[model samples]
Target: SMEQVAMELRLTELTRLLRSVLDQLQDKDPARIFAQPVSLKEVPDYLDHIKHPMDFATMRKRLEAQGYKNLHEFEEDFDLIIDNCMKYNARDTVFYRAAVRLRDQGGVVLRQARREVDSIG
Candidate 1:
């Protein structure tokens, strides 16, 4: 049960991470890139392949076993994930906004999935 709880927590963290990236992207030029709305439907697929954190089945099964039985549960968890995500995202946005104002007036770098910044400058 501990493993299950840990897994759920990890999933929550990961879901939060993805949401943070999406939020950061949304604050940026949404019309060009990252225009798509962030949802559980989109997130799982994106993370499954591109993000490559955990396999889709594993993610699904783990969450499912942890009392996430139906769409409502999934949706509820997703919202929680998004809320947590905004916390870190807000931090990064503030950090970058200040950093950019000081140095390059051109652009900013945002990295998703991995902990690296791909500069827009």
Candidate 2:
């Protein structure tokens, strides 16, 4: 039971991280420039020429980086992606409901772990 819960929590964390990154990529602010939309056929070459987010020349580079070496690689990873999407979608629903309540009360989630017990008196 603990292991299952831990796995779910890990998935939730991954979802939050992925959502943050996707939100930034989707933002349309003047300072945020996304890559030009190209056909799926051109994705591999486009990704190969692009760099990672911090080192990217432009937002396009970050978008392109998602295409990487081969489309087949991405296809193989699709199940993981789908799992994240499903899990994150569910987690977000709960987070939003809780966030609404917390927003009004200024509440925060307290995170602690058995690994982080510095001292017990």
Candidate 3:
């Protein structure tokens, strides 16, 4: 059907656009500061406060698995990364600052993707 074909086309295009956007996000933190899950050894009480955790590596894995159904879903995880950081770290801490930077830059990436791919809708 025409709808099925259109959905498939949008999926393909969105996937391609997300890959590049993810790359831009990863590049923002060269030290891989947010690369993996927060280490419990580093912050043993992290889970006690924040139930859901997110990281760049996990986001990439989910993206590769096609876990996100739409751009908003992808943004949810992206926002989680920042939210988790702000929850666990002090405002003056490096991690908190990094999350702030990521939140700002990630906004740019998602906005561009919305402009390019979401425009198809």
Candidate 4:
């Protein structure tokens, strides 16, 4: 189907954009706090407080599995990742600050993604 072709192309572009943004997030967090799931042993109350946990590793696996249906879905996970950090760590903490920058910097790339993909014609 012609529409299927278009969908596939858009999905490919979305995945590409997600990868770049994910890399930026990982780079921004040098301590690698956002790299994987929060250890329950380290923070026993983590899951109790954060119902929906998100991390760069989880997002990467999802991207590899083509789990996102659209750019919006990818953005949701991205936001979740940052939100989890902000919620778990206090305002003055390094984790919270890193989350802030990732959101700010990653957002720039995401907004630019739409224009870049649209110009793919």
lDDT of each: 0.38, 0.33, 0.84, 0.82
Question: What is the C-alpha lDDT profile of model 1 across 1-121, one tens digit per residue?
Answer: 9999977776665555444543443354323222223355755554443232222233345454544433344334333333333432454674334323422221232222343321211
Candidate 2 per-residue lDDT over residues 1-83, each given as its tens digit: 99988766655554444334434423322232222332338455543442321211332343344332322332233222223
The better candidate by lDDT, 2 or 4, is 4
- List the candidates' TM-scores in order: 0.31, 0.26, 0.87, 0.83
Off by over 4 Å in 2: 28-121
lDDT of candidate 2? 0.33
Clashes of 1: 0
* Per-residue accuracy of model 3 over 62-107 as CA lDDT, tens digit each: 8887777788888888888889889888999988999888888777
Q: Which candidate is the best by lDDT?
A: 3
**Top TM-score: which candidate number?**
3
| TM-score for candidate 2, residues paired by index | 0.26
Candidate 4 residue spans exceeding 4 A from truth: 1-6
Model 4 backbone overlap count: 0
Candidate ranking under lDDT, highest first, comes to: 3, 4, 1, 2
Off by over 4 Å in 1: 32-113, 116-121
